[PDB]
Amino acid sequence: MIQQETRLKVADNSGAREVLTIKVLGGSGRKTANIGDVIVCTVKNATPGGVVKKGDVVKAVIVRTKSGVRRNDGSYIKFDENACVIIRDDKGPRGTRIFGPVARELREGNFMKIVSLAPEVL
């Protein structure tokens, strides 16, 4: 279950360290979201140095929720935390040394870029 007013981690090297959410865009009245989606958020802890610094508005994309998913396979993928990653109105991220695992359900997301940028993908 993901909602706004929720603390999300990053897994890139842009200059952020932790964020939380303002919104879950989409449609009028849209509440919640999971992996494969675009959000806005703001940084309550920034990495010293880096581009993106604390107290700043940002967009981002979902990865590897603990509300993992189930596919047309009839089968399931879960994690033990969540994380986000920050973008540049282009499906192009700022930090470019992505850590940790990521899903496969974002090729459709057209972050194939990011997937090639990624470690192991699932």
Binding site: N72, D73, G74, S75
Partner: protein, 215 residues
């Protein structure tokens, strides 16, 4: 066109093509026989009458209803048949196609078709209104006394009354549903069930009346 009756037994899942998981429902239609053949000028509307399941026959001290009665048999014997237990009609379908005394088979349909199921809700009892209707409740703290019940009931003293069409509480019950545009999956003919994509109204061993959809 191509209606049929049965009862529902269970839900399952299937790896269809593409390794694709599909939840499904099993439907034991059986001994589905014609028991009359209505008409447009005889009985006012060109249509048919159908029975599903045979049962025990005429007997004595019929303290229950596994058996039949005199006119039950007297209707069952117009055509050559047995004591049914569930009987309905169909106006959608062609009838001159059909022939009284038939036992229309599960193989009439094929996997990969469109269907508008009809059955009944289960029914639950006497229910508050956030259950019976999609009403979101009121507080449970900050010193409240308005937890599940509703609030307003209508307008002010102007219109000193309470309109009909309210969504007050009441009896949550089995009742008619016409599901639409569903999928046929595999047409057994040995045990003679069908499998259908997803769920349907009603509890187990209930009843279903299916037919070809259109749109």
């Amino acid at each position: 066109t191509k209606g049929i009756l049965g009862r529902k037994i269970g839900m399952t899942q299937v790896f269809g093509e593409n390794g694709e998981l599909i939840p499904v429902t099993v439907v034991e239609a059986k001994e589905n026989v014609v028991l009359q053949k209505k008409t447009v000028e005889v009985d006012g509307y060109n249509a048919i009458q159908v029975g599903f399941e045979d049962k025990k026959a005429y007997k004595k001290d019929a303290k229950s209803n596994k058996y039949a009665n005199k006119p039950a048999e007297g209707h069952a014997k117009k055509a050559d048949a047995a004591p049914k237990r569930f009987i309905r009609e169909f106006r959608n379908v062609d009838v001159d196609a059909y022939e009284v005394g038939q036992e229309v088979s599960v193989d009439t349909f094929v996997a990969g078709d469109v269907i508008d199921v009809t059955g009944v809700s289960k029914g639950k009892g006497f229910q508050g209104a956030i259950k019976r209707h999609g009403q979101s409740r009121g507080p449970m703290s900050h010193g409240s006394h308005f937890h599940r019940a509703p609030g307003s009931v209508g307008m002010a003293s102007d219109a000193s009354r309470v309109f009909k069409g309210q969504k007050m509480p009441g009896r949550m019950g089995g009742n008619t549903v016409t599901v639409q545009n569903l999928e046929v999956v595999q047409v057994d003919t040995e045990n003679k069930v069908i499998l259908v994509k997803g769920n349907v109204p009603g509890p187990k061993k209930g009843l279903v009346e299916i037919r070809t959809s259109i749109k």
